[PDB]
Amino acid sequence: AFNDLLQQVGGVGRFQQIQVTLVVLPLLLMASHNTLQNFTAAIPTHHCRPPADAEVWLPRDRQGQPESCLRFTSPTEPCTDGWIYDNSTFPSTIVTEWDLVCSHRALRQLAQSLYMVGVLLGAMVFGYLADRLGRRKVLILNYLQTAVSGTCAAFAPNFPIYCAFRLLSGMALAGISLNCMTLNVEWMPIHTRACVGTLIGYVYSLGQFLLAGVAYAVPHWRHLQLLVSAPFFAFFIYSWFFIESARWHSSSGRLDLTLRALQRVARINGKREEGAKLSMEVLRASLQKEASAMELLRCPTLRHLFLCLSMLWFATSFAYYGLVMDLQGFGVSIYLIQVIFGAVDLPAKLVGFLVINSLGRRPAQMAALLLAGICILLNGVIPQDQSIVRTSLAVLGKGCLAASFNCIFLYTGELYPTMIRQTGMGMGSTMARVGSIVSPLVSMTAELYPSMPLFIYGAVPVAASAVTVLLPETLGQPLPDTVQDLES
Ligand SMILES: COc1ccc(Cl)cc1C(=O)NCCc1ccc(S(=O)(=O)NC(=O)NC2CCCCC2)cc1
Known part of the structure; x- marks a missing residue:
């Protein structure tokens, strides 16, 4: 009879209209943080750097395009010296930094694969620990981590550090995605369970526009990472004002906290007269009613x-x-x-x-x-x-x-x-x-x-x-x- 209690206190009130919006707002950065290896790791045209002993020094082929492998050993040798990258549209990228071209081409895919591998472990571990510590606590930790491990990757001097920090950022982001919807769908009535399910999808779909604008706004990759990871600190500073879900409190066994949360949300909504009518005995009389993974096998x-x-x-x-x-x-x-x-x-x-x-x-x-x-x-x-x-x-x-x-x-x-x-x-x-x-x-x-x-x-x-x-x-x-x- 939890739904009837929600309709009694006010159901869909100002508390929801504030909390759901302020919890779904940070999802605009999902698209930016997911598909970032299209602007942050673009491969510009490049060619072997000729030795400093000086146009005709490269075995150009395929309609005159300079060849990136050989360098005309004598006026057929590997470069092992360096490359001259273009700076007309892509001033700097990862490949320009550590020279992941023509011998380590697979490392971009490796970095993306590690970033994605750091999503499964998040969705598992922080989904396990979400139903044992509290939705808001885990959300706060996720907000802190996505900024702590996301902004320090822009200053990584080596490749493995960047890979590990991206992995941790994905670890946090996987948890944020699940916990957002999990906490949002709890406070809404049963008759409005599908409306919010579609709301998150359109919020995600709008982040590509922001990514496209921001990437053009700042070409550099370090600045791009810093900008796309910075606002999580602002989102975290305010994240202590959320109210814990009442369903979790009731299911846990502590009814006093559920009662107090119900009174509080009644005060925010302005229906304190019904909150005063709410008591311990009526809750035990109205909510008295309130599967292994191997059963699929x-x-x-x-x-x-x-x-x-x-x-x-x-x-x-x-x-x-x-x-x-x-x-x-x-x-x-x-x-x-x-x-x-x-x-x-x-x-x-x-x-x-x-x-x-x-x-x-x-x-x-x-x-x-x-x-x-x-x-x-x-x-x-x-x-x-x-x-x-x-x-x-x-x-x-x-x-x-x-x-x-x-x-x-x-x-x-x-x-x-x-x-x-x-x-x-x-x-x-x-x-x-x-x-x-x-x-x-x-x-x-x-x-x-x-x-x-x-x-x-x-x-x-x-x-x-x-x-x-x-x-x-x-x-x-x-x-x-x-x-x-x-x-x-
Ligand atoms: C994967 O479950 C969904 C499928 C579709 C939609 Cl609407 C929402 C969800 C959803 O809320 N799941 C729980 C948490 C969650 C959210 C997003 C992601 S995601 O992987 O980063 N997003 C996508 O894959 N596609 C999006 C949405 C559909 C249009 C194209 C962009 C992964 C997990």
Whole structure:
């Protein structure tokens, strides 16, 4: 009867209208801190530095472009001396700093892979410790860490220090993402649980505009990192004024704290007359009513569903986080491609929302996934001579994958049974990050062929699109109460 208590104190009042906004505001930096290795680690055109013994010193080939490997040993030797990087559009990047060109090309992918590896451990550890210390405490620690370990990376004199600090920043950021929604959805009524779920998505989708503006505003990478990591201190200074969730207090066993929090929120809302009526006995009379992860194993009915759901999550995450990177090579500047990519998610979600309930849950998923897969696989045959279809197909694929993410979230939310839903959603989201981890890993094979990663990126969604035909349709049906009655 917690919902009735919320409607008694006022339900959706000023307390919510302040706290939800002030808790969702810092999510505008997710897009900036996630896809930063497009502006902070761009590769400009470079060539071998001739010896200081002096135009014709390099074996230029492929339409006269200077060659970056050899240096005409005699007026066929490795450089081992240095490179002359261009400074017309990219004054300084990571490759310009430690010379990760033509011999250590895979280290950019390695850094991205480590940054993504530092997301799984966060989502695990700080999700475990969120239900044992308190949402607000963990949020405060996350706010402190994202600024402490994020601003000192801009002064790293070596590569491993930068990698480790980025890993820790991702560790904090993974926890902030989960805890934000976990604390936000608790204070809202049951009838407004889906409205806030879509709110976070559009907040995330707006951060690409800020990234595009800021990157142009400051070209330097150290200053860019400092600026994108600084505001977390301001967000942290105020973060002591939040109110702990009442549901967690009630479930823990301490009802006095729940009572006090209810009175306090009543004072903020201005309904103290009902708070005074609220007492200990009525709470014990109204809330008197108030699953292992291995149960998925040794029970085929849930294992069969979980396997397919995890496969879909993995395929979607792999395709999405392989697509969004490597903006270079499209002919158009990365700055413009950023805003173009950020301008296609809104219509993707808008169209997908209608089609989940109009066409069907599974029809929409299969159509979107197949279209994205074929569109991406098509990109690997047309030559780079073109400059229009290359961008059109990429943006269409990105939007389609965003719509696929919007559809699968609701599909898994409404598919699983009631009691095991909380752990099933977490397990499904867990497999949505291994694909992101492995995305930079398979891009390292670009040395073998110049489009093999692109072919790999299109085969997985195409294969997964035919896998959705093995799940029941559940449109316009009651939520399955339990496993016993779960038959159709
Ligand atoms: C992965 O569960 C979601 C899927 C879609 C949306 Cl709307 C929200 C969530 C969500 O709240 N999960 C819990 C916490 C969370 C949030 C974001 C991320 S994320 O990985 O950094 N974001 C994305 O992948 N895509 C975004 C959203 C969809 C359009 C394109 C941009 C990872 C975890």
